């Protein structure tokens, strides 16, 4: 029983040769047993989906340009950090209802900046703008297009915007086989749960999506703001890591806020975004992968077993996958195959596919 | 800000 | 537990958003429940102060006849307009002898004079019902011919336009009504106190703008630490200066000092006797306040709700349940200090501590006992009302009785409740619970 190595291209270290060797011819005699060691290494970069939420209030006006930069710059950095990226975004002002807006004179419903003789867009709960896409150019163009609206009071409904950013997928366009990051902007205090009771809204924000066709938070005027708890539930359940990118004015408020939400971080949204981009790459440093193998196109008659040697260099029998691999680590698997006699087919072909790897070990087997 | 105004 | 007495309202009406008790000079006790979206005779949701008489079966209530027509009064080259469109006539109700004060926080109000106007801002307005005399007076201490430009020019000093006056309201034992408008002074908040007798005497039909001589509006402030706190979102009255000759005002602002939230104790003359600050940020420390002698030593103690409080538990998890802060008044002329006791809910996302109902004493003994709300508590996530059997030392962390929502999802059962009032005169307070989402109110006649 000799196993001739056919395709043995070396592992890349970033062809993206993620499995070595690639093709093997296995020759067997009746009642035979034989073990060979394969090696596998992650090569290509990691997948990521960034959603971006922005204030649009009269207030936000002071730092509007600021938050716009925090979009585009961010994308650029994660273009240099990975190739498998998607980016999407949404905007928000406050609950569209008195006393948060101006309703007199009636023109205020179309322009609540009547007293300043200026034009501001009719203020809105949450208007989801761009679904997540690899088209970063379209994301940049749509982010820059957003402009300022008006409300009455200083706090704004950002938590409503985050809940509707994470709470639905099809509208927003996430990927199950990827990491998720959510960057939230503001410059003033945030309307939290129980703020909307000033406008007659006493029904909470639940864990369901209320955006349909019009690209608006339909149930904005009838659903209250969301609390930090349900925020955390929706961030964790969907595997979303939050970064509060806020102005230095009351950055302590959001540092305390981040202490209040497990796993989230806070950046000083300002003239620069170093404090936020460094935290982006920090969160990117913590992504751990898994190398798990399956075997396809093999009959039941042939029996198989294995050992495994991971990055820890500790040999384990019966464990086909270690938890928490990184980029560049090599894992070896010694597979033992036992054949019971010579079948009539006399020539088989099967695959060993690492889970989530398009590359596979194609094995041709002959019996003498 | 006291209201939606620039500080 | 069978006598879960149901009071019904029409669809849309939000029957139960606010509630209180009334005892006319005739002596008939009625549940006054405000449905802020009741359909008027003009097929418009404005508000309805359902004077529900105490009926075992409950059901639809006789909508007490409040003037729903908008007054386009003319005086001094000005037009006083009281926009009652979506006014919420019923988002806060109180009573005192044969007087019912039923306040529309969203009763928009305006002055048309040349091009300028007062802006239809939810100044609020308490309708004064004297049903025995049939006197339909009106009160709005916040109602003001002051133009928008005048308010802007003075850095919004005393900017009362957005009062939502009658957002909360209490009646002083002496007979003067104190209304808490969190929207006061540009959402800073304020208290406006005036006798009911004086406003009744000063009332004239179709005037809607008249200075009341005995009104007492709160002093505004300029320290940013009070900004957007909603200094008045919750209001109550207790004695904290140890001087029974004056009445002390306890104000809960749940967003005080950047979402920390506080409760201030002031004298009758609107001067700070003390301030008590929030432990956990964004927990809404001051959403609901409650003044009572939980200790029962003769000195009033303060109870604050924090319905967005999140605790730390095993595996280092921050689970959002809520909290109740109890501050105890020290013996003699001593100021209140650190949170005397701390009480916490169990169910996740329950908004535990949204509404606190002073229950007085449950077992008719002497330990002051209270109740607290959790509109989305319980295993199901529908509603929860938790009875805190208080102690001579303070408040126990394990609620004695938990009432679950018999309504479906979205009802916000327990969101506004009230006790301390005996309906059947059995000698025990009766807990009335305003499940607004289902347009119903549940009265539980608590047997100890
Ligand atoms: C109170 O609660 C809610 C809040 O308003 C109400 O819910 C809405 O009520 C309207 C009633 O006008 C309802 O419209 C009905 O739709 C039916 C079709 O599903 C209509 O046809 C009926 O179909 C029956 C099934 O075959 C048939 O047997 C019957 O003869 C009739 O033809 C019906 O006539 C109504 O127009 C809305 O669907 C409903 N919407 C929601 C979102 O709830 C509720 O009705 C109110 N209940 C009461 C008792 O007042
Ligand atoms: C959220 O961020 C804020 C800043 O934005 C952090 O505020 C910090 O709060 C601490 C106190 O928790 C401050 O330390 C001291 O505070 C006292 C004032 O409080 C005292 O209170 C007791 C009773 O509670 C009274 O008896 C005293 O008289 C007194 O009033 C002050 O006197 C000290 O000099 C000292 O400042 C700290 O200063 C403050 N930091 C800033 C930058 O303002 C807050 O910690 C943070 N939240 C959490 C949970 O960390
Ligand atoms: C991979 O591990 C398996 C067992 O999981 C190895 O089989 C062992 O071979 C040795 C002889 O060298 C025997 O003494 C053991 O009894 C066998 N199995 C076990 C687990 O005890 C197999 O040989 C390993 N492959 C390599 C590369 O050595
Ligand atoms: C194969 O298995 C034998 C025992 O079964 C072991 O001694 C040897 O180290 C293994 N590896 C190879 C590929 O020979
Ligand atoms: C209480 O106030 C009244 C009203 O002025 C006063 O006449 C009375 O003397 C006061 N009583 C005490 C004990 O101070
Ligand atoms: Ca700004
Ligand atoms: Ca606002
Ligand atoms: Ca006093
Ligand atoms: Ca006491
Ligand atoms: Ca007792
Ligand atoms: Ca009773
Ligand atoms: Mg703003």
Which residues span the domain enclosing A15? 1-42+288-368
Q: How far apart are CA A198 and CA A262, in angstroms?
A: 30
| DSSP code, position C405 | P
Ligand 4: does its nearest atom lie under 6 Å from the Cβ of A35?
yes
Question: What are the structure tokens assigned to A9, written together?
Answer: 């291209």
Ligand 4: does its nearest atom lie under 6 Å from the Cβ of A278?
no
What is the end-to-end Cα distance of chain B in Å, rounded? Answer: 5
Number of domains in chain A: 2
Q: With beta carbons less than 8 A apart as the criterion, state whether C257 and C190 touch.
A: no
Q: How far apart are CA C226 and CA A194, in angstroms?
A: 18
Same domain? A99 vs A248: yes
Domain boundaries C4-445, corresponding CATH code: 2.130.10.130
Contact A59 B5 (CB under 8 A): yes
Q: Three-class SS string for chain A?
A: CCEEEEECCCCCCCCCCCEECCEEEEEECCCEEEEEEEEEECCCCCCEEEEEEEECECHHHHHHHHHHHHHHHHHHHHHHHCCCEEEEEEEECCCCCCCCCCCCCHHHHCCCCCCCCCCCECCCCEEEEEEEECCHHHHHHHHHHCCCECCCECCECHHHHHHHHHCCCCCCCCCCCCEEEEEEEECCCECCCCCHHHHCCCCCCCCCCCECCCCCEHHHHHCCCCCHHHHHHHHHHCCEEEEEEECHHHHHHHHHHHHHCCCCEEEECCCCCHHHHHHHHHHHHCCCEECCEEEECCCCCCEEEEEEECCCCCEEECCCCCEEECCCCEEEEEEEEEECCCCCCCEEEEEEEECCCCCCEEEEEEEC
Looking at ligand 4, which residue's alpha carbon is closest to its atom 9?
A: A35
Contact C148 A115 (CB under 8 A): yes
Please state the φ and ψ torsions of residue A193, each to the nearest 5 degrees: -50, 140
Contacting residues for A242 by C-beta, under 8 A, at least 6 apart: A162, A182, A184, A231, A235, A261, A263, A264, A265
From chain B, the residues in CB contact with A153 under 8 A are: 3-4
| Helix H or strand E encompassing C150 | helix C148-153
State which residue of chain B sits closest to C221, comparing Cα positions. Answer: B2
Q: How far apart are CA C17 and CA A199, in angstroms?
A: 13
| Measured torsion, CA atoms of residues C329, C333, C338, C339, in degrees rounded to the nearest 10 | 10
Same domain? A177 vs A271: yes
Same domain? A258 vs A336: no
User: How, if at all, do strands C126-130 and C116-117 pair?
Assistant: unpaired
Looking at ligand 2, which residue's alpha carbon is closest to its atom 9?
A: C279
The reply to whether omega before A105 is within 30° of 0 (cis) is yes
Experimental method of this PDB entry: cryo-EM
| Measured torsion, CA atoms of residues A63, A64, A69, A75, in degrees rounded to the nearest 10 | 130
Q: How far apart are CA A223 and CA C433, in angstroms?
A: 21
Tell which residue, A139, A127, A131, has the closest CA to residue A92.
A127
C377 Cβ under 8 Å from any chain A Cβ: no
Q: Return the number of other C-beta atoms located less than 10 Å from residue C296's C-beta.
A: 16
Taking the CA of A34 as reference, the closest ligand is: 4
| DSSP code, position C226 | G
Chain C interface mutation, best of B2, B3, B5, highest count of C Cβ atoms under 10 Å: B2
- Helix or strand or coil: residue C199? helix
Q: How far apart are CA A294 and CA A115, in angstroms?
A: 68
From chain C, the residues in CB contact with A193 under 8 A are: 284, 307-308, 351
Q: How far apart are CA C323 and CA C318, in angstroms?
A: 13
Tell which residue, C146, C259, C91, has the closest CA to residue A227.
C259
Please state the φ and ψ torsions of residue A66, each to the nearest 5 degrees: -45, -60
- State the Cα angle at C169 between C167 and C172, rounded to 5°: 165
Same domain? A250 vs A126: yes
Q: From the CA of C425, how far away is ligand 11's center (Å)?
A: 5
- State the Cα angle at A287 between A282 and A290, rounded to 5°: 165
Q: How far apart are CA A267 and CA A241, in angstroms?
A: 13
Same domain? A306 vs A202: no
- CA separation (Å) from A316 to A116, A236, A324? 73, 32, 16
Tell which residue, A318, A194, A143, has the closest CA to residue C253.
A194
Contact C259 A189 (CB under 8 A): yes
Same domain? A258 vs A293: no
Same domain? A282 vs A340: no
- Helix or strand or coil: residue C202? helix
Q: How far apart are CA C446 and CA C148, in angstroms?
A: 49
Same domain? A189 vs A306: no
Q: From the CA of B1, how far away is ligand 6's center (Å)?
A: 9
Chain B residues with a Cβ under 8 Å from any Cβ in chain C: 2-3
Q: With beta carbons less than 8 A apart as the criterion, state whether C265 and C302 touch.
A: yes
Looking at ligand 2, which residue's alpha carbon is closest to its atom 7?
A: A252
Q: How far apart are CA C138 and CA C89, in angstroms?
A: 12
Deposited resolution, Å: 3.1
- Helix or strand or coil: residue C289? strand
Domain endpoint, select from A287, A317, A345: A287
Q: How far apart are CA C164 and CA C108, in angstroms?
A: 9
Question: What are the structure tokens assigned to A365, written together?
Answer: 């087997």
From chain B, the residues in CB contact with A154 under 8 A are: 2-4
The reply to whether omega before C306 is within 30° of 0 (cis) is no
Q: Which subunits have 3 or more CB–CB pairs within 8 Å of chain C?
A: A, B
Q: How far apart are CA C292 and CA C303, in angstroms?
A: 8
Domain endpoint, select from A256, A287, A318: A287
- Helix or strand or coil: residue C346? coil
Q: How far apart are CA C315 and CA C306, in angstroms?
A: 24
Q: How far apart are CA C39 and CA C63, in angstroms?
A: 10
Q: With beta carbons less than 8 A apart as the criterion, state whether C406 and C442 touch.
A: yes
Same domain? A365 vs A242: no
């Amino acid at each position: 029983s000799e196993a001739r190595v056919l395709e043995d291209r070396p592992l890349s270290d970033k062809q993206v040769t993620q499995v070595s060797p690639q093709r093997i011819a296995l020759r067997l005699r009746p009642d035979d047993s034989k073990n060979f060691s394969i090696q596998v290494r992650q090569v290509e970069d990691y997948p990521v989906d960034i959603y971006y939420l922005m204030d649009l209030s009269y207030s936000m006006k002071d730092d509007l340009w600021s938050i716009q930069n925090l979009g585009t710059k961010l994308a650029t950095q994660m273009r240099k950090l990975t190739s498998n990226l998607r980016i999407g975004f949404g905007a928000f002002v406050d609950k569209p209802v008195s006393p948060y807006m101006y309703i007199s004179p009636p023109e205020a419903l179309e322009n609540p900046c009547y007293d300043m003789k200026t034009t501001c867009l009719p203020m809105f709960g949450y208007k989801h703008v761009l679904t997540l896409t690899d088209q970063v150019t379209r994301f940049n163009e749509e982010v820059k297009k957003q402009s300022v609206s008006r409300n009455r009071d200083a706090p704004e409904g950002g938590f409503d915007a985050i809940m509707q950013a994470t709470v639905c997928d099809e509208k927003i366009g996430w990927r199950n086989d990827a990491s998720h990051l959510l960057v939230f902007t503001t410059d003033a205090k945030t309307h939290i749960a129980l703020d909307g009771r000033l406008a007659g809204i006493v029904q909470p924000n639940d864990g369901q999506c209320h955006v349909g066709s019009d690209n608006h938070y339909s149930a904005s005027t009838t659903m209250d703001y969301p609390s930090l708890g349900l925020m955390t539930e929706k961030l964790s359940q969907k595997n979303i890591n939050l970064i509060f990118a806020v102005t230095e004015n009351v950055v302590n408020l959001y540092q305390n806020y981040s202490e209040l939400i497990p796993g989230t971080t806070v950046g000083v949204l300002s003239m620069d975004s170093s404090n936020v981009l460094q935290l982006i790459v920090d969160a990117y440093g913590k992504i751990r992968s898994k190398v798990e193998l399956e075997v396809r196109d093999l009959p039941e008659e042939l029996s198989l077993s294995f050992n495994a040697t991971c990055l820890n260099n500790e040999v384990i029998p019966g464990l086909k996958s270690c938890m928490g691999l990184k980029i560049g680590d090599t894992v070896s698997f010694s597979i033992e195959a036992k054949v019971r006699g010579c079948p009539q087919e006399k020539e088989k072909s099967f695959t060993i596919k690492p889970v989530g790897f398009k590359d596979s070990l194609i094995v041709q087997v002959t019996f003498d | 800000x006291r209201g939606d105004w620039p500080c | 537990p069978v006598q879960l007495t149901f009071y019904a309202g029409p669809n849309g009406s939000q029957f139960g958003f606010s509630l209180d008790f009334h005892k006319d000079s005739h002596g008939r006790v009625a549940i006054v429940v405000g449905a802020p979206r009741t359909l008027g005779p003009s097929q418009e949701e404005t508000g309805g102060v359902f004077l529900c008489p105490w009926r075992a079966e409950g059901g639809q209530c006789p909508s007490l006849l409040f003037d729903l027509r908008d007054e386009t009064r003319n005086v001094g080259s000005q037009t006083l307009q009281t926009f009652k469109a979506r006014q919420g006539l019923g988002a806060s109700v109180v009573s005192w002898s044969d007087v019912i004060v039923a306040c529309a926080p969203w009763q928009h109000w305006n002055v048309l004079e040349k091009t300028e106007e007062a802006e239809k801002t939810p100044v609020g307005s308490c309708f004064l019902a004297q049903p025995e005399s049939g006197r339909r007076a009106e009160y709005s201490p916040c109602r003001g011919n002051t133009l928008s430009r005048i308010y802007v020019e003075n850095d919004f000093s005393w900017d009362k336009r957005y009062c939502e006056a009658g957002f909360s309201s209490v009646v002083t034992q002496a007979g003067e009504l104190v209304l808490g408008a969190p929207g006061g002074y540009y959402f800073l908040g304020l208290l406006a106190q005036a006798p009911v007798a004086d406003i009744f005497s000063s009332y004239r039909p179709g005037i809607l703008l008249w200075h009341v001589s005995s009104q007492s509006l709160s002093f505004d402030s300029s320290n940013p630490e009070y900004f957007d706190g909603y200094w008045g979102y919750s209001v109550a009255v207790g004695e904290f200066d140890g001087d029974l000759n004056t009445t002390e005002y306890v104000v809960g602002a749940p967003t005080w000092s950047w979402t920390l939230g506080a409760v201030e104790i002031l004298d009758s003359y609107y001067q700070r006797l003390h301030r008590l600050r929030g432990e956990q940020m964004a927990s809404y420390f001051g959403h609901s306040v409650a003044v009572t002698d939980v200790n029962g030593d003769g000195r009033h103690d303060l109870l604050v709700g924090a319905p967005l409080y999140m605790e730390s538990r095993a595996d280092r998890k921050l689970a959002e349940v809520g909290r109740v802060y109890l501050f105890l008044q020290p013996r003699g002329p001593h100021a209140l200090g650190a949170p005397s006791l701390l009480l916490t809910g169990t169910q996740l996302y329950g908004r535990f501590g949204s509404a606190i109902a002073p229950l007085g004493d449950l077992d008719r003994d002497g330990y002051n006992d209270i109740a607290v709300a959790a509109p989305y508590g319980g295993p199901s996530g529908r509603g929860q009302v938790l009875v805190f059997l208080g102690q001579s030392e303070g408040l126990r962390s394990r609620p004695s009785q938990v009432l679950d929502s018999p309504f479906p999802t979205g009802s916000a059962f327990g969101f506004s409740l009230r006790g301390a009032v005996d309906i059947d005169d059995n000698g025990y307070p009766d807990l009335i619970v305003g499940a607004y989402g289902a347009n119903q109110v549940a009265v539980y006649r608590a047997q100890p």
